[PDB]
């Protein structure tokens, strides 16, 4: 069947896969290539000293456990497959209360290339801290940060 071969490929990839271990654990550093597409820069709240931002947050990394040979080079899979594999535990250092949208479904996509390159993007609404100096108010200007990184994994 058309889909049974891809089912076999996915079963083979997940056979013996331990998502608790990062790629290259104990032998190399996991290099995560990241980018952000800001779909809308939310309003700034002076009272709370914060701001909102809606982003497509894209990450990508190499996982040699997930390389495959198949009819197509890229498997554009359901977001359910993301939970079955290791993904970075990225978090926002100055985030206050963020939302990972799941309407109608989890707004995530995972794509596995034949060479083992994974692309993984999420839709997020981040409410981040933007401390301000209001001595020049209302003629003031600010530089609101957005800082992110791994929560558990060091350099």
């Amino acid at each position, epitope marked *: 069947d058309n889909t049974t071969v891809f089912t076999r490929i996915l079963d083979r990839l997940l056979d013996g896969y331990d998502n608790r271990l990062r790629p290259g654990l104990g032998e190399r550093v996991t290099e995560v290539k990241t980018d952000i597409f800001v779909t809308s820069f939310g309003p700034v709240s002076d009272h709370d000293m914060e701001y909102t931002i809606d982003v497509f947050f894209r990450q990508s990394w190499k996982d040699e456990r997930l390389k495959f040979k198949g009819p197509m080079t890229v498997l554009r899979l359901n977001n359910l497959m993301a939970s079955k594999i290791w993904t970075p535990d990225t978090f926002f250092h100055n985030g206050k209360k963020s939302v990972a949208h799941n309407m109608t479904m989890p707004n995530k996509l995972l794509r596995i290339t034949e060479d083992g390159t994974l692309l993984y993007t999420m839709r997020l609404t981040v409410r981040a801290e933007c*401390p301000m100096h209001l001595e020049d108010f209302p003629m003031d200007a600010h530089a609101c940060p957005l800082k992110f990184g791994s929560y558990a994994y060091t350099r």
Partner: nanobody
Amino acid sequence: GSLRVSCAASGRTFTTYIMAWFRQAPGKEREFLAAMDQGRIQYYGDSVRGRFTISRDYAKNSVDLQLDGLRPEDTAVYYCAAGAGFWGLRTASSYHYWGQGTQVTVSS
């Protein structure tokens, strides 16, 4: 050769500001060495990454820079600065408060 250049602020609490170290050699323009943010996050220039280490004492309102692996081209006037990082964290124009500068020289 090793060194430690300290900077102490007075007249204003810089807890919520970025504190940075810059360098100016004779003839060359002012360049960014290091910066540290209220979130204890450290930014370094490419020329001095892994050698110079920036730190902040928030209780004393001070920023320190440990210098290791000095070379002859590190001879310059080193400036302490404080700012809000508007358009910056690397441009000198973003820092409103500046120290007088301290000479440093390396002899082979």
